[PDB]
From Swiss-Prot, chain B:
One of its GO terms (biological process) is virion attachment to host cell. The lineage of its organism: Viruses, Monodnaviria, Shotokuvirae, Cossaviricota, Papovaviricetes. GO terms for cellular component: host cell nucleus; T=7 icosahedral viral capsid. It is found in: Virion; Host nucleus. It comes from the Viruses. Belongs to the papillomaviridae L1 protein family. Its main location: virion. This is Major capsid protein L1. ISGylated by host HERC5, this results in dominant-negative effect on virus infectivity. Forms an icosahedral capsid with a T=7 symmetry and a 50 nm diameter. The capsid is composed of 72 pentamers linked to each other by disulfide bonds and associated with L2 proteins. Binds to heparan sulfate proteoglycans on cell surface of basal layer keratinocytes to provide initial virion attachment. This binding mediates a conformational change in the virus capsid that facilitates efficient infection. The virion enters the host cell via endocytosis. During virus trafficking, L1 protein dissociates from the viral DNA and the genomic DNA is released to the host nucleus. The gene is L1. Keywords: Capsid protein, Disulfide bond, Host nucleus, Host-virus interaction, Late protein, T=7 icosahedral capsid protein, Ubl conjugation, Viral attachment to host cell, Viral penetration into host cytoplasm, Virion, Virus endocytosis by host, Virus entry into host cell. Pfam families: Late_protein_L1. Self-assembles into homopentamers. The capsid has an icosahedral symmetry and consists of 72 capsomers, with each capsomer being a pentamer of L1. Interacts with the minor capsid protein L2; this interaction is necessary for viral genome encapsidation. Interacts with protein E2; this interaction enhances E2-dependent replication and transcription activation. Interacts with host KPNA2; this interaction mediates the nuclear localization of L1 capsomers. Interacts with host ITGA6. Interacts with host SDC1; this interaction promotes efficient infection of keratinocytes.
Length: 469, 460, 50, 40
C-alpha cells in the first residue's frame, strides 16, 4: 500500500516566490489606552459604557492592513509585467516598543471562599458557619509572549458540553468537561495559573477567583494544534517566557462533593470527630522582575520559520498579538470633594483607579512577485480561494459561474412589490470577531535611513545606503 | 563478549514518520471514584504525580513493501525499525498543583517556641498541606523501566517478632506500572505495609508504593536495552520543621544529655521531618517541546527496537494545576449560603508523541543466528527463519459429536494467542499501526530533521 | 533595574464606585457590607550585587 | 499614488566631518554633596 500519488504535498513557499531588491518601512506614531482594571463603567440605568474596562492582563489583538502593492507603482516599474503577475508584501522584521516604567500591579476580591491557614494551625479549626469569605488578594503569574502571522491566533479552553444521556443530571452533579478550540478575541484574559475554562458556567459561586477573570473565559495558546497547521500560516513564529511559585495554601469551604473512603485513614474523635474540607488551592506568586527577561525593545530577524510561509502575508493582512504582565502597575489618585476643612477625615476623599497602556509597532517589509501558470493557479486555489478574488489574473473570472441578471423593475416602492436594498459592503467574514484596530495605509516611506529602527537593518547587512556627499 | 550492535546492522536510505493525534486525560487527583455499593469505578483517579507509561506497537516492516523493493532479498534477511529521534509535546499552561491531608501526625512548630509544649493528648492531627518536589525526567528504550523501592522482608528467625518491633528493611526491584507515584522526597517504599498510621503523609501516596529509577542496575544491563537514554532535572528546598507525636520507640541514652525538671521533667518526642517545598518554576528548565537527536547511547543498542515494540515513560510536575469548580443546587435564593454549592476537583492531562524512525536490514549466518538466540530467542518466533519441523501423522474425527453417542469430550487448545507475557502488568496504551507516512515535508517535526542534515527541500 | 512584591494593602476612604452586584452575590452579617476594593503593592528592592 | 521624493536625506554626520590625530583629556577633581533626604 502506497497508497496513491496526489496530495500534491504542500511545498515550501520559497519555491515559487521570488525576492526583490526593494524594501520599505512605516509605523504608527504610537498607541495609548486608559481603562479601569476590574470592571467596565456604564451609566447605571443605561447599558452604554461610560469608561472602557482595561488592564494589562487583557490580551491585545493587533490587526494591520496593508495597501495593495499592486495599486502602488514604483520609481522604476519596468522590471516586471503587472499583467501576467502580481505583487505581494513580505515581512522580514518586527519590533515592539514599550515605554512605561516597569512595575507590578495586582488584583483581589472582596469575598473569596476560604477556610483558614493550612500552613500552621495550633488547634483544629472552628465550625463552618455561613459565608466566611474574606477580602484577600494575590499577584498573577508573570508572563511575556509574542505572536505573529497572517491568521488569527487559535485558542483553547476547558468548557462544559452535554453529558451523554443515561443518567438524568440532577442539580449538583459533576458537569462533564470538554476541550474546545476557538478564535481569540481582545479583552480576553491570561491564565492566572487556574487554567483556561469558563468560570461563569462552571463556577456558580462566582466568588471563587479574583474579579477580573470571574466574568470571561481565560484562554491559552496551543502550540501543537496551531503549529500543526498544514500551511503554518496561523503563526509562523513566536517567543515566550514565564515563571511562577507558591505563596500560600488555603481551603475551600462548602458542601462536600464526595468524602474520601474511610479505609484511606482512621476514624477520629472529639475535635477529630469530623473531617475538615478536603480542598486545597495554591496562591500563585509573581517573582522578581528583571530588565533582562524583557523580550521587547529589541529587534527581531526572521529568515526560516517552522511553517512553509516565509513572511508572506496574504490579502494585505497581518496579525500581531502580544501580552505583558510587567507594566501592570496601577496608579491610584484621590480627589477632594471639600477643600476647606483642615481636619483629616475619610469622608472627604473619593478614590478612582486608572491604568496605563503603551504600545508601538514598527514593521519592516520586503517586496515580491509571483509567476502564473496552471499549477500555480491550481495550488493557490486549493489553499485559500478567497485570496484570488482581491486579485485579478484575469479573474477566474467565472469558469466559476455567472449571476442570472438580477431583476430591476421600475417601481416607486409604493407599487405593490417587495423591498430591495442595494447590497455588498462586507469584505471580512470575521467581522463577527471584534478586536483592536489600526490603519497604516498612508504611512509607508521608501528610505530606511530616516528611521531609528531601519538603519539597524542596514547595519545587519552593512551596505552603505549611499549617502556619499 | 557482547558487541556493538552497529557491527552487523546496516543503515538504509529511507525514513518515515507517524504520530498520534493527541492524548487527553481527566481524573481526580486524590482517590478513585466508584459506586458506593459496587466495586466498579465511576471516575478514574488521575493526577500529574501519577507516572505515565507509554507502550507503542509498530507494524512489522517486513509486511510493509516499498516503492522500490529490489534492493534486498526479503528471504535471506529481515527488516527492523530503528529510532533516531523523539519528541514530547505538552500543551497546558504551566502551573503548580498541590495536595494535603486532613489528619496528619504533628506536634507543633519546632522553629520557634516561647514556652515548652503542652501535654500529649489523643489525636492532635491537623489539616495541613504541602507542595511536592518539582521534577522532570524522560525515559526511552525497548525494555520496561526497572523500579526499586524500600520494603519489608522476613526477619531472620532468632527472636520471635512481637507487635511493636522494628520491621527489617529490604531493597526490592520491580517492573514499573502506570499510576505509580513519584517520590515526594520521602523515598520509595510501601507506606501501606510499613506505615500503619496511614495518616503520616498526604493522601495521594498513602495507598501505593512510590518508586524511583535506579540508573545503576538499569544501565548495568549487559545489552543496555532496558533504556538507552534519559534526562532528568529536579530540585527541592526546606520550608517547615515538625514533630511526630506518638509512642516513643526508643529513648536516647541519658548520657547524651542532662536530666531536666519541672517543665523539663519529661522529654518531648525526638522525631522530626521536613516539609518539602517546590521552587520557582521557569519556562527554561522545561525539557520538552524541543527535539532530540540520538546517535550513540551508553548501551550497545543503537536505536534498535526489537519486536516492533518501544517504551516511553515521562513524568512532569509542572502542569499539576488543579482547577476547582462549583455547581449550584438551588439557583433561586439571592442570599449567599455555604449550603448551596457542591465542590468537585478535576485535573487536566495533555500528551503528544511524534517519533522519527530509520529502516534497517540484517544479514544472517550461524554466528548471527546464534548470537541473537542467546540474547532473546522469543524474537525469532515473530520472524520466519526459525524451523522447527512439525509432526502429526493421524487423527480420528468420529463425527459428529453433538450426536450424543459418546465419543470423547473436547477441544482444549486455546492456550496460545498469548503474546505479551507482561500482560499481567497493566499500563496506558496507544496504537500507531495505521499512521505512517513516507514524506517528512508534510509534518512540523520532520522538516527539522531535514534542516539538521539540510539536503535539498527537494525540487520544484 | 529590578523589583518584586512584598506586601498587599487596602486604601481606606470614600468608595468611588461599587462593582455591579452581578459580579458577586450578596453577603450578610459580617458580609453585609463590602470592604474597600482597592489594593496596592509594596515594592521591595532585592539583593544588590557588586 | 507614487511617492514623490522631496527629501534632503538627513544624513550621517560621519559624512562631512573629518577626524584628526589629536586627543586630550580633563576631569573634575571630585564632586561632593550633602543634604537631608526627606524635606529641605
Amino acid at each position: 500500500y502506497l497508497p496513491p500519488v496526489p496530495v500534491s504535498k504542500v511545498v515550501s513557499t520559497d519555491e515559487y516566490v521570488a525576492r526583490t531588491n526593494i524594501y520599505y518601512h512605516a509605523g504608527t506614531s504610537r498607541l495609548l489606552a486608559v481603562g479601569h482594571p476590574y470592571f467596565p463603567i456604564k451609566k447605571p440605568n443605561n447599558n452604554k459604557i461610560l469608561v472602557p474596562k482595561v488592564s494589562g492582563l487583557q490580551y491585545r489583538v493587533f490587526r494591520i492592513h496593508l495597501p495593495d502593492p499592486n495599486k502602488f507603482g514604483f520609481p522604476d516599474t519596468s522590471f516586471y509585467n503587472p499583467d501576467t503577475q502580481r505583487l505581494v508584501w513580505a515581512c522580514v522584521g518586527v519590533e515592539v516598543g514599550r515605554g512605561q516604567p516597569l512595575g507590578v500591579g495586582i488584583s483581589g476580591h472582596p469575598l473569596l471562599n476560604k477556610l483558614d491557614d493550612t500552613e500552621n494551625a495550633s488547634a483544629y479549626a472552628a465550625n463552618a458557619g455561613v459565608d466566611n469569605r474574606e477580602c484577600i488578594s494575590m499577584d498573577y503569574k508573570q508572563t511575556q509572549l509574542c505572536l505573529i502571522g497572517c491568521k488569527p491566533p487559535i485558542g483553547e479552553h476547558w468548557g462544559k458540553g452535554s453529558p451523554c444521556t443515561n443518567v438524568a443530571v440532577n442539580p449538583g452533579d459533576c458537569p462533564p468537561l470538554e476541550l474546545i478550540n476557538t478564535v481569540i478575541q481582545d479583552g480576553d484574559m491570561v491564565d492566572t495559573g487556574f487554567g483556561a475554562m469558563d468560570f461563569t458556567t462552571l463556577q456558580a459561586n462566582k466568588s471563587e477567583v479574583p474579579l477580573d477573570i470571574c466574568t470571561s473565559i481565560c484562554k491559552y495558546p496551543d502550540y501543537i494544534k496551531m503549529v500543526s497547521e498544514p500551511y503554518g500560516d496561523s503563526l509562523f513564529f513566536y517567543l515566550r517566557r514565564e515563571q511562577m511559585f507558591v505563596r500560600h495554601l488555603f481551603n475551600r469551604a462548602g458542601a462536600v462533593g464526595e468524602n474520601v473512603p474511610d479505609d484511606l485513614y482512621i476514624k477520629g474523635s472529639g475535635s477529630t470527630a469530623n473531617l475538615a474540607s478536603s480542598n486545597y488551592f495554591p496562591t500563585p506568586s509573581g517573582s522578581m522582575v528583571t530588565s533582562d527577561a524583557q523580550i521587547f525593545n529589541k529587534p527581531y530577524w526572521l529568515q526560516r520559520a517552522q511553517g512553509h510561509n516565509n513572511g508572506i502575508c496574504w490579502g494585505n493582512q497581518l496579525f500581531v498579538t502580544v501580552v505583558d504582565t510587567t507594566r501592570s502597575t496601577n496608579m491610584s489618585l484621590c480627589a477632594a470633594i471639600s477643600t476647606s476643612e483642615t481636619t483629616y477625615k475619610n469622608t472627604n476623599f473619593k478614590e478612582y483607579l486608572r491604568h496605563g497602556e503603551e504600545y508601538d509597532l514598527q514593521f519592516i517589509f520586503q517586496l515580491c512577485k509571483i509567476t502564473l501558470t496552471a499549477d500555480v493557479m491550481t495550488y493557490i486555489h486549493s489553499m485559500n480561494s478567497t485570496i484570488l478574488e482581491d486579485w485579478n489574473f484575469g479573474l477566474q473570472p467565472p469558469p466559476g459561474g455567472t449571476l442570472e441578471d438580477t431583476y430591476r423593475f421600475v417601481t416607486s416602492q409604493a407599487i405593490a412589490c417587495q423591498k430591495h436594498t442595494p447590497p455588498a459592503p462586507k469584505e471580512d467574514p470575521l467581522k463577527k470577531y471584534t478586536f483592536w484596530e489600526v490603519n497604516l495605509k498612508e504611512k509607508f516611506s521608501a528610505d530606511l535611513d530616516q528611521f531609528p529602527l531601519g538603519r539597524k537593518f542596514l547595519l545587519q547587512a552593512g551596505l552603505k545606503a549611499k549617502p556619499k556627499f
